[PDB]
Design an enzyme around this catalytic site. Structure first.
Site, PDB file in Angstrom:
ATOM      1  N   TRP B 292       0.861  -1.179   0.000  1.00  0.00           N
ATOM      2  CA  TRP B 292       0.000   0.000   0.000  1.00  0.00           C
ATOM      3  C   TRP B 292       0.900   1.232   0.000  1.00  0.00           C
ATOM      4  O   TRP B 292       2.110   1.124   0.201  1.00  0.00           O
ATOM      5  CB  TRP B 292      -0.942   0.024   1.198  1.00  0.00           C
ATOM      6  CG  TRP B 292      -0.256  -0.162   2.499  1.00  0.00           C
ATOM      7  CD1 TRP B 292       0.433   0.785   3.219  1.00  0.00           C
ATOM      8  CD2 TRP B 292      -0.192  -1.373   3.258  1.00  0.00           C
ATOM      9  NE1 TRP B 292       0.918   0.229   4.374  1.00  0.00           N
ATOM     10  CE2 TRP B 292       0.549  -1.091   4.429  1.00  0.00           C
ATOM     11  CE3 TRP B 292      -0.691  -2.671   3.063  1.00  0.00           C
ATOM     12  CZ2 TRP B 292       0.812  -2.064   5.400  1.00  0.00           C
ATOM     13  CZ3 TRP B 292      -0.434  -3.641   4.032  1.00  0.00           C
ATOM     14  CH2 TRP B 292       0.317  -3.332   5.184  1.00  0.00           C
ATOM     15  N   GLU B 297       4.476   9.488  -1.532  1.00  0.00           N
ATOM     16  CA  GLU B 297       4.603   9.017  -2.913  1.00  0.00           C
ATOM     17  C   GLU B 297       3.610   9.730  -3.828  1.00  0.00           C
ATOM     18  O   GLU B 297       3.949  10.147  -4.937  1.00  0.00           O
ATOM     19  CB  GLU B 297       4.374   7.512  -3.001  1.00  0.00           C
ATOM     20  CG  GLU B 297       5.480   6.665  -2.439  1.00  0.00           C
ATOM     21  CD  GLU B 297       5.171   5.187  -2.598  1.00  0.00           C
ATOM     22  OE1 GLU B 297       5.487   4.638  -3.672  1.00  0.00           O
ATOM     23  OE2 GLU B 297       4.595   4.589  -1.660  1.00  0.00           O
TER      24      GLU B 297
HETATM   25  C1  HEM Z   1       3.412  -2.963   2.767  1.00  0.00           C
HETATM   26  C2  HEM Z   1       3.429  -1.653   2.462  1.00  0.00           C
HETATM   27  C3  HEM Z   1       4.635  -1.025   1.720  1.00  0.00           C
HETATM   28  C4  HEM Z   1       4.993   0.251   1.834  1.00  0.00           C
HETATM   29  C5  HEM Z   1       4.308   1.299   2.716  1.00  0.00           C
HETATM   30  C6  HEM Z   1       6.159   0.481   1.010  1.00  0.00           C
HETATM   31  C7  HEM Z   1       6.797   1.674   0.857  1.00  0.00           C
HETATM   32  C8  HEM Z   1       7.740   1.878  -0.115  1.00  0.00           C
HETATM   33  C9  HEM Z   1       8.202   3.156  -0.596  1.00  0.00           C
HETATM   34  C10 HEM Z   1       7.659   4.509  -0.100  1.00  0.00           C
HETATM   35  C11 HEM Z   1       9.156   2.929  -1.518  1.00  0.00           C
HETATM   36  C12 HEM Z   1       9.929   3.996  -2.320  1.00  0.00           C
HETATM   37  C13 HEM Z   1       9.496   3.923  -3.785  1.00  0.00           C
HETATM   38  C14 HEM Z   1       9.782   5.189  -4.581  1.00  0.00           C
HETATM   39  O1  HEM Z   1      10.109   6.264  -3.989  1.00  0.00           O
HETATM   40  O2  HEM Z   1       9.664   5.119  -5.836  1.00  0.00           O
HETATM   41  C15 HEM Z   1       9.325   1.493  -1.648  1.00  0.00           C
HETATM   42  C16 HEM Z   1      10.224   0.845  -2.465  1.00  0.00           C
HETATM   43  C17 HEM Z   1      10.383  -0.509  -2.717  1.00  0.00           C
HETATM   44  N1  HEM Z   1       9.542  -1.526  -2.255  1.00  0.00           N
HETATM   45 FE1  HEM Z   1       8.222  -1.141  -0.669  1.00  0.00          FE
HETATM   46  N2  HEM Z   1       6.497  -0.699   0.386  1.00  0.00           N
HETATM   47  C18 HEM Z   1       5.565  -1.658   0.792  1.00  0.00           C
HETATM   48  C19 HEM Z   1       5.517  -2.975   0.360  1.00  0.00           C
HETATM   49  C20 HEM Z   1       6.379  -3.615  -0.504  1.00  0.00           C
HETATM   50  C21 HEM Z   1       6.222  -4.955  -1.026  1.00  0.00           C
HETATM   51  C22 HEM Z   1       5.011  -5.862  -0.718  1.00  0.00           C
HETATM   52  C23 HEM Z   1       7.276  -5.213  -1.830  1.00  0.00           C
HETATM   53  C24 HEM Z   1       7.651  -6.497  -2.601  1.00  0.00           C
HETATM   54  C25 HEM Z   1       7.271  -7.716  -2.187  1.00  0.00           C
HETATM   55  C26 HEM Z   1       8.138  -4.071  -1.796  1.00  0.00           C
HETATM   56  C27 HEM Z   1       9.328  -3.962  -2.468  1.00  0.00           C
HETATM   57  C28 HEM Z   1       9.963  -2.774  -2.727  1.00  0.00           C
HETATM   58  C29 HEM Z   1      11.153  -2.615  -3.536  1.00  0.00           C
HETATM   59  C30 HEM Z   1      11.972  -3.712  -4.251  1.00  0.00           C
HETATM   60  C31 HEM Z   1      11.437  -1.116  -3.525  1.00  0.00           C
HETATM   61  C32 HEM Z   1      12.600  -0.420  -4.243  1.00  0.00           C
HETATM   62  C33 HEM Z   1      11.955   0.562  -5.223  1.00  0.00           C
HETATM   63  C34 HEM Z   1      12.794   0.559  -6.452  1.00  0.00           C
HETATM   64  O3  HEM Z   1      13.952   0.060  -6.365  1.00  0.00           O
HETATM   65  O4  HEM Z   1      12.320   1.054  -7.496  1.00  0.00           O
HETATM   66  N3  HEM Z   1       7.565  -3.106  -0.997  1.00  0.00           N
HETATM   67  N4  HEM Z   1       8.444   0.887  -0.776  1.00  0.00           N
HETATM   68  N1  LIG Z   2      14.928   4.302 -14.442  1.00  0.00           N
HETATM   69  C1  LIG Z   2      14.430   4.175 -13.403  1.00  0.00           C
HETATM   70  C2  LIG Z   2      13.815   4.135 -12.268  1.00  0.00           C
HETATM   71  C3  LIG Z   2      14.246   3.275 -11.273  1.00  0.00           C
HETATM   72  C4  LIG Z   2      13.536   3.199 -10.079  1.00  0.00           C
HETATM   73  C5  LIG Z   2      12.378   3.955  -9.889  1.00  0.00           C
HETATM   74  C6  LIG Z   2      11.621   3.872  -8.577  1.00  0.00           C
HETATM   75  C7  LIG Z   2      10.265   3.168  -8.692  1.00  0.00           C
HETATM   76  N2  LIG Z   2       9.881   2.702  -7.349  1.00  0.00           N
HETATM   77  C8  LIG Z   2       8.479   2.308  -7.427  1.00  0.00           C
HETATM   78  C9  LIG Z   2       7.962   1.485  -6.265  1.00  0.00           C
HETATM   79  C10 LIG Z   2       8.389   0.175  -6.059  1.00  0.00           C
HETATM   80  C11 LIG Z   2       7.856  -0.579  -5.014  1.00  0.00           C
HETATM   81  C12 LIG Z   2       6.905  -0.020  -4.160  1.00  0.00           C
HETATM   82  C13 LIG Z   2       6.370  -0.757  -3.113  1.00  0.00           C
HETATM   83  C14 LIG Z   2       5.416  -0.172  -2.288  1.00  0.00           C
HETATM   84  C15 LIG Z   2       5.035   1.151  -2.509  1.00  0.00           C
HETATM   85  N3  LIG Z   2       4.128   1.758  -1.708  1.00  0.00           N
HETATM   86  N4  LIG Z   2       5.569   1.850  -3.528  1.00  0.00           N
HETATM   87  C16 LIG Z   2       6.489   1.291  -4.354  1.00  0.00           C
HETATM   88  C17 LIG Z   2       7.012   2.037  -5.408  1.00  0.00           C
HETATM   89  C18 LIG Z   2      11.939   4.814 -10.892  1.00  0.00           C
HETATM   90  C19 LIG Z   2      12.650   4.897 -12.089  1.00  0.00           C
HETATM   91 CL1  LIG Z   2      12.083   5.993 -13.398  1.00  0.00          CL
HETATM   92 CL   LIG Z   3       3.760   0.421   7.322  1.00  0.00          CL
END
Ligand code: HEM
Ligand SMILES: N#Cc1ccc(CCNCc2ccc3ccc(N)nc3c2)cc1Cl
Ligand SMILES: [Cl-]
Ligand code: HEM
Ligand SMILES: N#Cc1ccc(CCNCc2ccc3ccc(N)nc3c2)cc1Cl
Ligand SMILES: C[C@H](O)[C@H](O)[C@H]1CNc2nc(N)[nH]c(=O)c2N1
Ligand SMILES: C[C@H](O)[C@H](O)[C@H]1CNc2nc(N)[nH]c(=O)c2N1
Ligand SMILES: [Cl-]
Ligand SMILES: [Zn+2]
Lengths: 404, 416
Positions: B292, B297
């Protein structure tokens, strides 16, 4: 290879080739990034190689590499190191080095200003008393009745088998932190240690919230001496809000001059353990960090309660709303008082311009993203969206252990 | 003292050491000469789709490592079942070049990948992940059914539930399963005649691709995109999500009554669909997952980024702020009210959301849990600290150590 550096708001790409001129290790390795660490973990030709590089910089900078003024200046430097294990800089070299050290500082968002720096040579200084005189003069020049001017005062370099010149205080202007009996702290909690040290060296403490500390100054291998700054030297701005009349009440104030005095200035291998420098404030340093940090004055809930906000829950953003008014009060008050200050929007905008000038002049600019991005309103500023490369160039401002 | 990274919290004055980074088998972007921790996609955070199998003993060593992680996690490390599983995998890789995960290994892997994600502040929740095993899926049409099922389960009428659906792994000499879209829900971005963009500029390229592949485009600011789903060695096919499956929240503000009239909205489910799930050297190129939202975001990045919806000035003008000087802090003021609206509107709609204060507070708790459990927690500070109110959150004052552990969610080239 080279860092491809992207700005994500514009789509623009640069390549940093200046980092290739770095020959001091930062904290990271391919196995783990430690860029968020505040401090680092902890022959005579290392000195020589550092010195020739600085001299080469100096003459490159002033039109005349390869000239025989360059060649004999080089020659002076090995003769001195070969004979004495050390050497000495000429004033113009020190002025250039001081400016390069500020230019090279990855954590400073204020480097658009870097070429405009008043350098005071205080290397003919043999006592704590003389240090005080120099410092008083630094503050008068820098404060300039509110039209702040950047300056550095450089005290004698470190020498083998002799104690350092040190200013014990982290800044020339600091508010006392009085540790209270029952856990809490009156004043600035960041200054409990230096307040205590001042008292142990015979200072009569106040009991206010904003008592200006005395300076502890130390000549080599002597106990530090205590000097009270004359109140007329220390410009302070009372904090009031432009629309919330009750804010002025709060009894908040901050001083005008950010004058950092515990860093070590390194030029050509030479180290100046006492070289205090000052600029002017970016408003978030005072309004967000110094007043709202939980381990600082921590006034968020106070303001929030006066603003009649919902303290009970985080999702009302009471913290966010309170912080915005405090930063506005700091901007308002300084501008009212005619004391130089820059807001974080203006500051990061000028830093983007600095990056562009630097890309053109040197092929890059070392920058610490976590320090360049302000502590509120991060992605609302252009630096948030700008990739940065962090590395150590010399001349450098460095951290050094507390002298006690 | 200890020859591991010393990690300090500057609010509390407390110190930890990270020993978990010692299990890092993969280099990040930084060297002792230059720190690249602020780069979004340095090429050491990117992969390459090789159509041929991994060199069997590179695969084998990754496989052995993951199987050890698995048997450690169920405390049968060294057991006969453990040694038999390794032998079975060595055999499988030997005769077919690859191997297959048991079901509970897949579940353990998916949770571990999440747990290991340095940029996720949501990781306190990492043990609660519904894993949908879809490695049986054999058509683009079936991918659609699996995705709709995921969306229905995960959305749960606003009471959101973390989930991942796992489609078949990369296979030697056979095309990938891929979802072309970056999320399951994305608003369209229409490049305009006058050069501007109607809708979400982040999505111009995927929008144009949907149009090229036959979608009839709308022209709103909030048109939900169709999905472009790709089964092995087949062209991507176009699927439209039934509008009732896509829960959205109209944005209103608790006291600024005009805010509702801006007609802003956001979808409830953040469902990322273009990341590669890597487990023991196996590569799941289609494995969408959802949790969620953290409210910044939406309220800060998606609505206020200059290259996104860019509504700051609009809101500031409605609020009657001084927009022609920085020191009015009109941007800051507008940003707070837009975040308040997001939080308030989701709360009113009974749709799960968490504010950045509550998020970062839980992440500190997660850090302490992981300190005890594993001796550290890989964390990307620049991504963990929220895009507003940075030092007002506890994580700002927490030093962090960043490194790559596998199982991992990794970036991968766009299929086109
Ligand atoms: C349960 C509630 C969750 C919250 C509140 C949350 C919150 C966030 C936030 C705020 C980011 C930053 C993304 C951005 O700025 O673009 C993020 C990134 C990320 N989340 Fe979570 N997340 C949640 C669940 C999950 C789940 C279920 C997964 C995978 C099973 C996950 C995997 C990731 C990964 C791999 C990133 C790195 C983003 C990227 O590298 O682009 N998250 N999350
Ligand atoms: N190129 C590139 C690139 C590489 C990374 C990203 C970040 C995207 N992150 C999105 C994301 C992934 C996982 C999430 C899980 C939970 C949540 N609430 N938001 C997420 C939001 C954006 C860009 Cl444009
Ligand atoms: Cl949370
Ligand atoms: C002229 C106006 C200036 C502004 C607005 C400015 C701004 C800033 C800010 C906001 C920081 C972050 C500090 C923190 O958060 O603790 C910083 C750091 C720093 N600044 Fe500047 N600065 C100015 C002038 C100078 C000058 C004149 C020097 C030296 C000659 C300097 C050298 C440094 C150094 C070395 C750091 C690193 C701080 C540290 O590591 O503690 N700055 N600056
Ligand atoms: N230990 C430690 C430690 C090390 C560094 C810091 C950051 C202190 N930086 C203060 C500073 C330095 C230079 C400045 C230049 C200009 C300006 N306006 N403010 C500055 C503020 C804080 C701590 Cl607690
Ligand atoms: C842990 C974290 O690195 C630390 O709190 C840093 C982050 N960024 C900062 N940025 C500035 N300008 N000043 C600071 O003191 C810090 N502190
Ligand atoms: C250049 C910089 O790395 C980029 O703007 C990053 C900064 N931190 C971030 N943090 C989060 N959570 N999400 C992001 O997209 C980004 N973007
Ligand atoms: Cl400035
Ligand atoms: Zn790094």
């Amino acid at each position: 290879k080279f860092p491809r550096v992207k700005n994500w708001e514009l789509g623009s790409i640069t390549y940093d080739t200046l980092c290739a001129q770095s020959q001091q290790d930062g904290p990271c390795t391919p196995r783990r990034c430690l860029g968020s660490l505040v401090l680092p973990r902890k022959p005579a030709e290392q000195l020589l190689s550092q010195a020739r590089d600085f001299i080469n910089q100096y003459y490159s900078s002033i039109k005349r590499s390869g000239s025989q003024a360059h060649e004999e200046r080089l020659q002076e430097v090995e003769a001195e190191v070969a004979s004495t294990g050390t050497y000495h800089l000429r004033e113009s070299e020190l002025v250039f080095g001081a400016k390069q050290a500020w230019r090279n500082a990855p954590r400073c968002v204020g480097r658009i200003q870097w070429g405009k720096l008043q350098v005071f040579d205080a290397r003919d200084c043999s006592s704590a008393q003389e240090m005080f005189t120099y410092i008083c003069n630094h503050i008068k020049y820098a404060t300039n009745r509110g039209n702040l001017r950047s300056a550095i005062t450089v005290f004698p370099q470190r020498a083998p088998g002799r104690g350092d010149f040190r200013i014990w205080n982290s800044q020339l202007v600091r508010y006392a932190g009085y540790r209270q009996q029952d856990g809490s702290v009156r004043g600035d909690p960041a200054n409990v240690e230096i307040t205590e040290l001042c008292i142990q060296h015979g200072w009569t403490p106040g009991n206010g919230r904003f008592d200006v500390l005395p300076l502890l100054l130390q000549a080599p291998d002597e106990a530090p001496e205590l000097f009270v700054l004359p109140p007329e030297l220390v410009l302070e701005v009372p904090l009031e809000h432009p629309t919330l009349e009750w804010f002025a009440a709060l009894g908040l104030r901050w001083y005008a001059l950010p004058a950092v005095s515990n860093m070590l200035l390194e030029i050509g291998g030479l180290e100046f353990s006492a070289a205090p420098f000052s600029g002017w404030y970016m408003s978030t340093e005072i309004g967000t960090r110094n007043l709202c940090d939980p381990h600082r004055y921590n006034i968020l809930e106070d303001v929030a309660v006066c603003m009649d906000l919902d303290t009970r829950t985080t999702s009302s953003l009471w913290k966010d709303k309170a912080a915005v008014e405090i930063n506005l009060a700091v901007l308002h008050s300084f501008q009212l008082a005619k004391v130089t200050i820059v807001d974080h929007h203006a500051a990061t905008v000028s830093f983007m311009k600095h990056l562009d000038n630097e890309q053109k002049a040197r092929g890059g600019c070392p920058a610490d993203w976590a320090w360049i991005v302000p502590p509120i309103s991060g992605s609302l500023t252009p630096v948030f969206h700008q990739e940065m490369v962090n590395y150590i160039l010399s001349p450098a401002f460095r951290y050094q252990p507390d002298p006690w």
